[PDB]
Design a protein around this ligand. Structure first.
Ligand SMILES: C=C1C[C@@]23CC[C@H]4[C@@](C)(CCC[C@@]4(C)C(=O)O)[C@@H]2CC[C@]1(O[C@@H]1O[C@H](CO)[C@@H](O)[C@H](O[C@@H]2O[C@H](CO)[C@@H](O)[C@H](O)[C@H]2O)[C@H]1O[C@@H]1O[C@H](CO)[C@@H](O)[C@H](O)[C@H]1O)C3
Ligand SMILES: O=c1ccn([C@@H]2O[C@H](COP(=O)(O)OP(=O)(O)O)[C@@H](O)[C@H]2O)c(=O)[nH]1
Length: 448
């Protein structure tokens, strides 16, 4: 037997793909151990076939994390902190587990989130191979490696507000404004992304949550920048992430979806950490009403600054056609026959889930990789429309109708159906994703 240890970043967009990958690898005959923080832990009772080991977070807590908020923006401070200080404990936990290993059992490798760059030298120090899971797109990695050129051209300077609507220089898939929001947290990101890249290039292999026919234009960059083999597997085509949900599913929504005509419902969800002003929240509500479409809107408590959930919303505001809920099994909703479009914040998991279920998109964004996802999907693949100028109710209503009803949007709807079919085909024998998965299993079995 061969065991794989996986080490996720403890946020919804990172736990989801790594436990999909864990299940795919389990299906291939590997045993599975998950190293996880107590913070944001998933429900281990959902994974009787995995062993969980909780680390880095144990009582009593380090002065460096003991008082970090558990929600809101700053919860993410755990990522730089653990990278800076978690090495010794990670090494101890890996050695512990390796020491207790059975005789016919060996640890093939460690797979970590790409953002745990600190784990590379820990793995090296144990003669343990480390593979990296990328939870965001090849297109974004391509942008990351281009940061020095972006820096030189002034794109990363926030006070330089000049060339906003222009094509970016030798990266003409983007507009300058895209790069400016993606990298507005430049003081922190330049450090983290530089080390992420370096330790990804130093790893023994890189698993991408993508597929070749999704990001064909980006494969050359990955082959040239990363010496180790890359494997593109679209995890939502293997299984949904419902078992790793960190929140309770409403699931009263499906009875409601069963009462709607096919493709008549706009699914709306702006992610698992984004926050909005009261002014923009109410404007989004208005646009949804103005569109005249049915909608199912996931509003995370705390999404509105600074109400506890949707208090600013007048009771019954509009309509018979709309519902607000706290949380759903998202991919299962996207797969429902009633869904005609997905208004998303462009998180990569949501974007890829929508592509894999053939649902065209309306794009907003809250920075990070989201504006690049939105730009690539709307301008390269052409499976959605990007609301790239804030929140105006009239523009929102037009975007929703263009995707969902207008004849002029048919080509977008059709592009989304075809892209889903390409994803499905990529999993057949001889398809790109099937071959990537076969090579990954063979490769990992050889490290042992
Ligand atoms: C690398 C990161 C370092 C980080 C440390 C915390 C820091 C902030 C949040 C900046 C503001 C101040 C501060 C202090 C703050 O906490 O407010 C800073 C930037 C983003 C962050 O990663 C982000 O952390 C969030 C939790 O707070 C996660 O929820 C995001 O995951 C989610 O992961 C998804 C899958 O990767 C992604 O598609 C989605 O947009 C994202 O919201 C994840 O996105 C990462 O952002 C990076 C930016 O360059 C990308 O390159 C990575 O691929 C991407 O995964 C967290
Ligand atoms: O109501 C919801 C909303 C979101 N999700 C899941 O949460 C993850 C969000 O990841 P993403 O990368 O899109 O954005 P983030 O929230 O991390 O910014 C995805 O796998 C979604 O399917 C869900 O399961 N139920």
């Amino acid at each position: 037997r061969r065991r794989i240890i996986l080490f996720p970043v403890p946020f919804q967009g990172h736990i989801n793909p790594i436990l999909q990958l864990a299940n795919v690898l389990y299906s291939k005959g590997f045993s599975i151990t998950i190293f996880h923080t107590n913070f944001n832990k998933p429900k281990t009772s959902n994974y009787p076939h995995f062993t969980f080991r909780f680390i880095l977070d144990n009582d009593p807590q380090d002065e460096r994390i003991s008082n970090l908020p558990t929600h809101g923006p700053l919860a993410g401070m755990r990522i730089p902190i653990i990278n800076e200080h978690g090495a010794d404990e990670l090494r101890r936990e890996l050695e512990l587990l390796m020491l207790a290993s059975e005789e016919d059992e060996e640890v093939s490798c460690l797979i970590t989130d790409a953002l745990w760059y600190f784990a590379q030298s820990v793995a090296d120090s144990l003669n343990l191979r480390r593979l990296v899971l990328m939870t965001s797109s090849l297109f974004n990695f391509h942008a990351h490696v281009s940061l020095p050129q972006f820096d030189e051209l002034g794109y990363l300077d926030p006070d330089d507000k000049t060339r906003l609507e222009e094509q970016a220089s030798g990266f003409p898939m983007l507009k300058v404004k895209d790069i400016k929001s993606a990298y507005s947290n430049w003081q922190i990101l330049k450090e983290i992304l530089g080390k992420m890249i370096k330790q990804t290039k130093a790893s023994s292999g890189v698993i991408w949550n993508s597929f070749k026919e999704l990001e064909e234009s980006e494969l050359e960059t990955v082959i040239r920048e990363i010496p180790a083999p890359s494997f593109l597997i679209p995890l939502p085509k293997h299984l949904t992430a419902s078992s790793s949900s960190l929140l309770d599913h409403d699931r009263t929504v499906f009875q409601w979806l069963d009462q709607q005509p096919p493709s008549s419902v706009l699914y709306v969800s702006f992610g698992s950490t984004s926050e909005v002003d009261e002014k923009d929240f109410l404007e989004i509500a208005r646009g949804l009403v103005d569109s005249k479409q049915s909608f199912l809107w996931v509003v995370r408590p705390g999404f509105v600054k600074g109400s506890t959930w949707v208090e600013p919303l007048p009771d019954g505001f509009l309509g018979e056609r709309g519902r607000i809920v706290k949380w759903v099994p998202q991919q299962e909703v996207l797969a429902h026959g009633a869904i005609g479009a997905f208004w998303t914040h462009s998180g990569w998991n949501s974007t890829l889930e929508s592509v894999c279920e053939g649902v065209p998109m309306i794009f907003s964004d809250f920075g990070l990789d989201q504006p690049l996802n939105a730009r690539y999907m709307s301008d390269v693949l052409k499976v959605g429309v990007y609301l790239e100028n804030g929140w105006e109710r009239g523009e929102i209503a037009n975007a929703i109708r263009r995707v969902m009803v207008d004849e002029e949007g048919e080509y977008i709807r059709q592009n989304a159906r075809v892209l889903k079919q390409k994803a499905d085909v990529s999993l057949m024998k001889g398809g790109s994703s099937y071959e990537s998965l076969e090579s990954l299993v063979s490769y990992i079995s050889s490290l042992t």
